[PDB]
Amino acid sequence: LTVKSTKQWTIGTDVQGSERLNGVSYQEDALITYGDYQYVTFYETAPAGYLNHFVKVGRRRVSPSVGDWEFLTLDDYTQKTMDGHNMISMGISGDGKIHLSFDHHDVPINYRISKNGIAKDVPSKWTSDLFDPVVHELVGSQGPYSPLTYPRFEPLGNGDLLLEFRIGQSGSGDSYIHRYSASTGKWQAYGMYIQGDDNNAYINGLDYLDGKLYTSWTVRETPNADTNHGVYFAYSNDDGKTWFNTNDTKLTKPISTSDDSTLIWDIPQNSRMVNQEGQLIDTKGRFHILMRDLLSGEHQYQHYLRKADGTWTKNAINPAGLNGPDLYDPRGKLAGDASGEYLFGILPDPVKQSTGIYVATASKDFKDWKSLAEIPNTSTEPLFDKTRLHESGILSVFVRQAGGFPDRKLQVWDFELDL
Numbered sequence: 551l552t553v554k555s556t557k558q559w560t561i562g563t564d565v566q567g568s569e570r571l572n573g574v575s576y577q578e579d580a581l582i583t584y585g586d587y588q589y590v591t592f593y594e595t596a597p598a599g600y601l602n603h604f605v606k607v608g609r610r611r612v613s614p615s616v617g618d619w620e621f622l623t624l625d626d627y628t629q630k631t632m633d634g635h636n637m638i639s640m641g642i643s644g645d646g647k648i649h650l651s652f653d654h655h656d657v658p659i660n661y662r663i664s665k666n667g668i669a670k671d672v673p674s675k676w677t678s679d680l681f682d683p684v685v686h687e688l689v690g691s692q693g694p695y696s697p698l699t700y701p702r703f704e705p706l707g708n709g710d711l712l713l714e715f716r717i718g719q720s721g722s723g724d725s726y727i728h729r730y731s732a733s734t735g736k737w738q739a740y741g742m743y744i745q746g747d748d749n750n751a752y753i754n755g756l757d758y759l760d761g762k763l764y765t766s767w768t769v770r771e772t773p774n775a776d777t778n779h780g781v782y783f784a785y786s787n788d789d790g791k792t793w794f795n796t797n798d799t800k801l802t803k804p805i806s807t808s809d810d811s812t813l814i815w816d817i818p819q820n821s822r823m824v825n826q827e828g829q830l831i832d833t834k835g836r837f838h839i840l841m842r843d844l845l846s847g848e849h850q851y852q853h854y855l856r857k858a859d860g861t862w863t864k865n866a867i868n869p870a871g872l873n874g875p876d877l878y879d880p881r882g883k884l885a886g887d888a889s890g891e892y893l894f895g896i897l898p899d900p901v902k903q904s905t906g907i908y909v910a911t912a913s914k915d916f917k918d919w920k921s922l923a924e925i926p927n928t929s930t931e932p933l934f935d936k937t938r939l940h941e942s943g944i945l946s947v948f949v950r951q952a953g954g955f956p957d958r959k960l961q962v963w964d965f966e967l968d969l
């Protein structure tokens with residue numbers, strides 16, 4: 551596999567502050583293709599200046615030809631909290647509505663939706679008046695809505711959308727799922743699905759495929775990031791209502807962090823493994839986790855694979871030239887092509903200040919990590935567009951540059967693959 555073309559666009563000037571608010575590992579999602587268009591969301595500085603930001607949403611046509619980006623500015627909600635948790639997630643349901651949830655660290659939900667199904671009935675002009683106001687609840691559902699952190703969306707097969715998040719705090723919290731019906735426009739509460747025990751689960755993502763929902767996590771004892779332990783897994787056949795472990799054993803509802811039956815790899819505290827890194831269900835139904843640790847004696851990214859025969863394996867991702875990350879370094883992602891043969895590691899490198907794109911293949915049991923491409927000049931937790939890669943074989947990555955304000959830009963990089 552090779553690259554046919556590399557293209558990039560600058561979509562904004564990143565915001566100033568001592569935290570990164572754009573390009574954060576748990577944005578789910580920042581960059582989405584739906585129908586014939588690609589969408590992106592990010593903060594930009596408002597006219598009041600430093601510590602005042604607005605959410606922006608971009609769109610461009612990508613099929614059957616690629617058109618120019620255009621942006622709207624949601625100038626009715628001012629983001630002011632310089633806390634690296636306070637990112638934006640976007641989702642697009644099968645009625646065409648665009649959902650946003652943003653700006654949380656242990657506070658009530660902030661959510662808004664488009665008035666109309668603007669990703670389905672595509673409007674000529676792209677303006678902020680396409681969005682309804684910020685609200686602090688999910689119409690049709692019920693709380694708790696606070697203290698919330700980490701909103702994550704997952705589109706289901708019938709057009710519906712899940713929204714998942716933590717209620718509680720680092721070191722003591724639970725997670726909940728809500729489901730939006732594209733047919734009725736109402737939310738419903740699926741309830742608490744994982745319950746902490748003087749700790750909290752930190753999931754890596756949500757991955758839905760062919761009727762099954764997959765997640766993986768580590769458990770955090772305290773607000774100190776050295777107190778993560780374990781790599782855990784579960785899946786659901788009913789979009790989050792009921793859950794099973796890797797051996798198909800039904801779990802209690804909610805899943806307790808104290809239930810060791812979901813553990814797939816023992817990783818002690820102090821292993822330099824970070825929470826909320828990456829996961830992937832590939833199109834063949836193999837599940838993958840990206841984490842890191844120091845347990846070999848060197849810091850390395852780690853690939854966990856749930857193999858078709860059921861066994862889990864763990865392999866370091868150590869292609870030539872990749873500098874392995876420590877606990878606080880930017881987090882990566884795993885992407886997959888349509889065929890399920892190609893696994894992409896989208897791995898920020900802390901020494902190079904760049905994002906590496908590496909590929910491994912299912913034929914070689916994913917052991918054949920090779921450098922495929924690079925995005926230079928990043929200080930980001932890279933995020934990609936699943937649907938665009940499946941539909942057109944283009945790996946599209948949203949990144950925050952490295953460098954100083956106001957030189958540091960937000961970009962989208964497209965790698966057209968010779969798939």
Ligand SMILES: *[C@@H]1O[C@H](CO)[C@@H](O[C@@H]2O[C@H](CO)[C@@H](O[C@@H]3O[C@H](CO)[C@@H](O)[C@H](O[C@H]4O[C@H](CO)[C@@H](O)[C@H](O)[C@@H]4O)[C@@H]3O)[C@H](O)[C@H]2NC(C)=O)[C@H](O)[C@H]1NC(C)=O
Pocket residue numbers: 796797813814815816862
């Ligand atoms: C429910 O699922 C869990 C989680 O997957 C599963 O537990 C895992 O079982 C496997 C298989 O027994 C364990 O892996 C082995 O552990 C022993 C040590 O106790 C090792 O000796 C093994 O390594 C040898 O065998 C490997 C075979 O490929 C060789 O490759 C290797 O080089 C060694 O010769 C092997 O690693 C694994 O530790 C657990 N995991 C956890 C987290 O407990 C459990 O069995 C499932 N239960 C049911 C009833 O299905």
Ligand SMILES: [Ca+2]
Pocket residue numbers: 578703704755756757758
């Ligand atoms: Ca997802």
Ligand code: NA
Pocket residue numbers: 720721722748749770771772
């Ligand atoms: Na705790």
